[model samples]
Target chain A: MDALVDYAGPAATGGPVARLTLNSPHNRNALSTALVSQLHQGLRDASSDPAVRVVVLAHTGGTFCAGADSAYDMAVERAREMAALMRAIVESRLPVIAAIDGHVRAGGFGLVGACDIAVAGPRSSFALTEARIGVAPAIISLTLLPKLSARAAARYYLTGEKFDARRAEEIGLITMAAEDLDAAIDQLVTDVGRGSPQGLAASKALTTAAVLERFDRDAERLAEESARLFVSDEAREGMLAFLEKRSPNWT
Target chain B: MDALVDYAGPAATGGPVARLTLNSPHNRNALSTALVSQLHQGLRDASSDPAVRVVVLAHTGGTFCAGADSAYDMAVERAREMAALMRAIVESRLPVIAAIDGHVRAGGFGLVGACDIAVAGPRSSFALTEARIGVAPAIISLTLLPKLSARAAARYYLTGEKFDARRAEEIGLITMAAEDLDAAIDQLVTDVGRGSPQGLAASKALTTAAVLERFDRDAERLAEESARLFVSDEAREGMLAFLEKRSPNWT
Candidate 1:
């Protein structure tokens, strides 16, 4: 079948593992509305394809993702689109793994949280620079809260703290840290893809449902709350300034 | 309404930020069934009461909570009940901020882990301390997993390693650290209660849901696999020796 995404390439290797690479290296693999839409399509295709068991999300460039493209920060429209795409990734029944090579910041952190597992290269760095840019880490908060302690999320998201690969692994954000990028991706594919395809899919679905069950029944309310923040005046100004390459006029 | 707990008094001036101090100074306020149950009820009541915006759970005397009554190890029912109550505090809608005054160990660690926000005094210490006593930190794992990085949780929960406030803050477990207990509790009450009540409650609820949404569906399978290990000869012998107050035959 023809792939649905232009910025993302999906290829199937041995057994049931499918490798999906973000193909927009020229932009530091930064997320654009087009890329986000394509990624959504690509993930949907992977999830529906019976031949694909595990989805490994990697990037073609030296950077995993620098987060949303600063050029397209028109309004909450772009942020909302990216947030929806990330939610889809998190809610996917197929197990997803992120292979990080270099920098993973802001929305990229959201991608890491959406995946079932993440392996980072030794040189990689992680940060949430939203607060520094005058943006609330609202959308990222959904995925991050699951992966980080509430206190940690508050500190990093609020202070925009920068951390290294070791700290990322130590904090449970990255499952493994490899000396090299290719080696890390290989390890993830070998370990996660060796499992039975049916079992892998079932495992992903079951875990998501079980975890969701623990919370009060307010998924819709949470979504609405998240949406409200995304559309706030603060997020708009933050995104615009980021796109314009200037400090946000928050005052 | 009459208060069911009284380890600490209300803040000098703030919204409903009730402080519950662990009162048993002689034993560092070792968690007893009566205390945990009352605290749980206090939290639930605070959540429903219109006056209460946030809960500041602190301790008096020296320590915050020193774990369960050591003398009540044979009291299985009490242990189980305490675990359930702690879980209730964690699942509460109103944000619960734990102000660690001194040492927080075993079940006390569980309580701190369960709270939405945690602040500790510089002198505070934390440890799971379950493995040393031949018991599994099973129930605590549920709450701890929500707030701790997998690596830190495994290290402390498995080895029962002692850590201080600085390490706790670094790992994202504690929101802030203070030079003294009073300063920590005061800051917690002020910071948490300053937010709009509706917004805080909604944000707390949304964040909790987002965290719960990350559980792997195969958790039940993993639990079953772990249970098999629990029944192995190694675990059985280990438990037996500890129960008999002697070394295990493994060595």
Candidate 2:
């Protein structure tokens, strides 16, 4: 068990709020195999508890996440774990909120998109950098594309440029970004926690049914495709260039 | 028999726009079967009108719309009519815009959720007023849930609080909320009308495919559920409480 996740959860009080923190700032909290598994378990634990009403996914560092396969060396095992984590958040009985107070990029953006609601700090930023890194955001697309307008998705997925939190919200990725990031998260937790458990569960089931259906049908296939891209010889230079901060060598 | 809906529509110039007004302010635009039918016919007429490139749902009174069945005395007959009107807008050849300026609650929120784009005036407000009176928001959930983030939906549906236009847009309930309501709407109408009818239809179809699927498959079942809840002893108390301006005997 990699100690990459800090789960302080299901505060079943008048306002029930569960908190999950990405603890691996060294790798910018990339979705390593261990981190994904820990996240999956943390979410499941929070969701299973009767006391927990809202799950807040946060981070402990400057960059919320740098993305997957960057520090990749067969986080190939990570694909299955990643899919499960996404499903857990999307299909959970409790609503999931992303309280992002740091930079959210690539695969991390996918996790943010998967949450029921997202709140961003003033300093938070976003990008889908996979294209520049010589890989595609295959699996992340399942969650991210559904949330975004086709116009916005088309631009960001292709450009791989860094966007501020305001751009992130306008594109319909995060629900809202505010200067009072913590206050916004608190208000959201209060609102979400106000729901009857029955209401929250039923409402979420209806809201996410379509996305969940897509995930159910295509997650395994997308995961396999993503793994192949990561393991491919062509993507090797892209990965190398990503760490080295240089362009990938073609031919 | 109120003139429940007024159609001022299908003004399809090079930049075509259709306008529909909820005329039943005497009843606060409640979803009476008759009102729903008028709205359905108006939408159908505009949807079929070759000149119409966009449909704009507007209101005649300070109160945009009463909740769907806020006074659903004939809820049994109201379900199908409401469902049909919702479908007519969703399946229309042109994209729909909700030109909101006043109050939107309950089923009215569903209509707002169903539109392709929505622009709100500074004074606009929204709420999901169903649960307070007993019935779940079953029918409207089909449209409403899809537009909402799991986080926002959980909060709004359960709490049934009045949120302002800015909050509505932040949660993706409306496209934009502005002080210059007319300009915002004009801008959206201009941008959306820029698409050829064929292009708009193709684009919206791709973006809303799964939601359309849910409408095709689960609408009727959910309609049945809504009708049942509306007539239930529990919900009966809820509606009664709403009308009497006193809490129901749920006590």
Candidate 3:
């Protein structure tokens, strides 16, 4: 649990709901190895703690998460760790709610998608910035495909387009949009509280498990293909170009 | 094979693609007992037929499908048959494409949602219509949620709101929009036919199997609750009003 302390701060207010806030607002709460690791541990803790029925994921600063910290140089390791962390969030028995404000992009969008319920402010914007940065959103696609429509996911994943709150709502990304940040958070907490804890936990676990089973059973072979792509010259060049701040040579 | 004869009628040339109209358009292509049984058989036949590389489903009349015929009046039997038929479409190994030309309400939208790929014409509109009519779209929800955003499903399912093609596309209901019905059907067929048959079948099966595993593994318990609601007094009352050509009492 101490490892998680570095990545997030705890704020448990009332019965059954625990709030885990992203501590690093300086980089717009960008996810670092330590942060993702800590968040995973926190979620694990919340799952075991009977006092906590719902986990509310929020951030200290205005933004929810700007995605994986660009400052961290371990691309491959970080990606793997990030994927594992996201899987944890998705697998948690307790309902997970994301309270989003300001800008959410790249892996940030992944985090939002990983949660079971999401509430966003009218000012919030979402994007998958991986393609624009010449990196593949392989991990994000896993969580996002379940939450978004195929066409919308395809367009966003391919083009790395930015969209507003209303568009996000239309696509079923955000369950509800609030006028302001506080209102959004309040709405999220309230909605999560209304459901029967046993039902919610069972349903969430069941749904997530079902989807993962489908992914594992059906996509195993295709996943092998994806793994090959990861080791390809194109992927390598893309990653290098992204890190170097230059357009990919493939262009 | 003869059972499938009416599931899809005589093939007609439309642009570069072939159209297999859902011939029971008089019932608004409503899935009757016979139709459902035939469709299940037709999908099996199409799966083995190499000549049918890509199948485009369209209705001969104005509406796509009104879902299960409420006028059938045998609730328990109809429910069981409907569930079985829907499962057949969902479990099909082929790349089934739905070309929605007009309003697809209630179970009709569910039919489109179950397809591997979908293209909607400019005139197309979609609605769940379950809540408004007193029925819960329990089985349809299983198919629809995989293709739609959970947020969109929640909103549309609860409100029974009518949404246009642009909105449907934005929300990930329809993959692409065509200028007219013919164009939409053509695009759907071409899109399905573009890939190698082996690749297409593998991908379609993989994707569908993955999704089914996810939902089925996790939500089995909730399925009973949902099914109960689907056949409740409210659902019956709603259907009765519609049959009697009067506004529902709940409305």
Candidate 4:
């Protein structure tokens, strides 16, 4: 099987800077049981590798990671696993940079919020499509809430509206949205790389500790609840409406 | 009864989108006890109204609100009242949008921070002027801290320098600013209007829960501490000099 996340070896994945490309474009990089595990393991490997200075999360297509659980009800357990992936990004000794270049929605938005610094492309847009599909954005909120103003989140999360990169920056989701994606990432990498690994790690603790503690305290049950919601009659109706390209029954 | 928050009727107050004007132009819309109570009551009413989709927090004249608790002598009750009002906004089911277009200083900066989404015109400027008055930005920090990046917060919170709306957006204080204040608010209202009421409420819980919980957890103690600092000898001198149009003795 293809590795879900292919790294630049310990050479860079465990060195001055680490970058992971969500290699599986199938399911548009949905959090599958297999993919989530692979991603978590990669993050863990980088976290322990004292050489890694910063971790970069990028994807291969216009669509980045889709939802928390692509496997349906089983997706929630996978979401628990995916929650670990967010934790992995946060708990890593090195800061993470999300170089988003395409459409990111649902669980993927949370991943962007977890990063220490993020730069996105002109093509990048985001949505919180969970409520439309019947589940609430519970698991991701553990990390994502700190960045979004309550009003901004209310608008996007409820409407599942497609917000452009500029709005994302204004709302404090990602660090910046640039026209030249690669150049922005390059500059960010250079700026971030200037910090000593120890300094970065110590500084990261000031923010990450609160989020990780909340994660460990609340994520598992939220996963279970989200999974339960996924399987519930309301959500099932929502998913069916979505699949059929119709308005949800509630309307 | 002179309405604390001046509104025409439930037609306007409980409309699909409600706008409450801070009516105290006399004090430059300072956070007096009566105004805070009125603001809180207005928010509570709009929150429960099924028709109210959004709540707009707007102000009159050239000032949005001067520091709500600026009086060194009257700071205690005003601080508590300000804390309660911030709580009322956060706790509301309807999202609050701040329409700011003038000088926002010290505690007024925090009030804007308490809002969910804020829009300002080119004429708008902000300063966390509390330190100049020998008190910390303590009470409002409960809601403001999460939005302002530590680096930006440190610089502004310490120097209490006047910053423009662009700076506010860059530092992650307000949501966005525009050359046309009403245009920005109109676009925001249009963007925010697309969500279902239930969807907006449930989705909002994701972001507001943590911040409100933090406020609930710490508001009282911080309020007390803020009042304490306001009455300190240094703060008294700062306020007196501010009123007398001269530098404090320490300076």
Compute the DockQ of candidate 4: 0.24
For every model in order, what is the number of clashing pairs? Answer: 5, 4, 7, 0
Model 4 lDDT tens row, A89-207: 78778888888888887778778878888888888878776765566788888877767755566556654667798988977798888999877877777777789978988999998
Q: Residue A179: error of model 4 in Å?
A: 7.2
Clashing pairs in 4: none
For residues B93-212, could you state the per-residue lDDT of candidate 2 as single tens digits? 778888888887767867887888888887787777565565567778778777775456655665466788888777778888789877888878888887888898999888778788
TM-scores for chain B, in order?
0.75, 0.87, 0.80, 0.90
Better of 2 and 4 by DockQ: 4
Q: Tell me the deviation in Å of residue B107 in model 3.
A: 2.0
Q: What TM-score applies to chain A of candidate 2?
A: 0.89
Over 4 Å off, model 2? A1-3, A9-14, A69-76, A242-247, B1-26, B37-61, B69-77, B88-101, B110-123, B129-137, B141-214, B225-251
State the lDDT of candidate 3 residue by residue for A1-251, as single tens digits. 22223323225374456778777755778787677767777778777765565777776556777776722234455565666677788777677777777788767877887777777876688777655544566766667777776678778878777888878876767776777867656644554444333434434543565457645553434334445555666767878887888888767
Location of the lowest summed lDDT over 10 successive residues in candidate 2 chain A? A68-77
TM-score of each: 0.54, 0.74, 0.52, 0.76
Worst 10 residues of 1 chain B by lDDT: B214-223
lDDT of every predicted structure (CA atoms): 0.64, 0.75, 0.64, 0.75
Per-model DockQ against the true two-chain complex? 0.12, 0.23, 0.08, 0.24
**Residue A10 of model 4, lDDT score:** 48
Q: Candidate 3 or 4, higher lDDT? A: 4
Global lDDT of model 1: 0.64
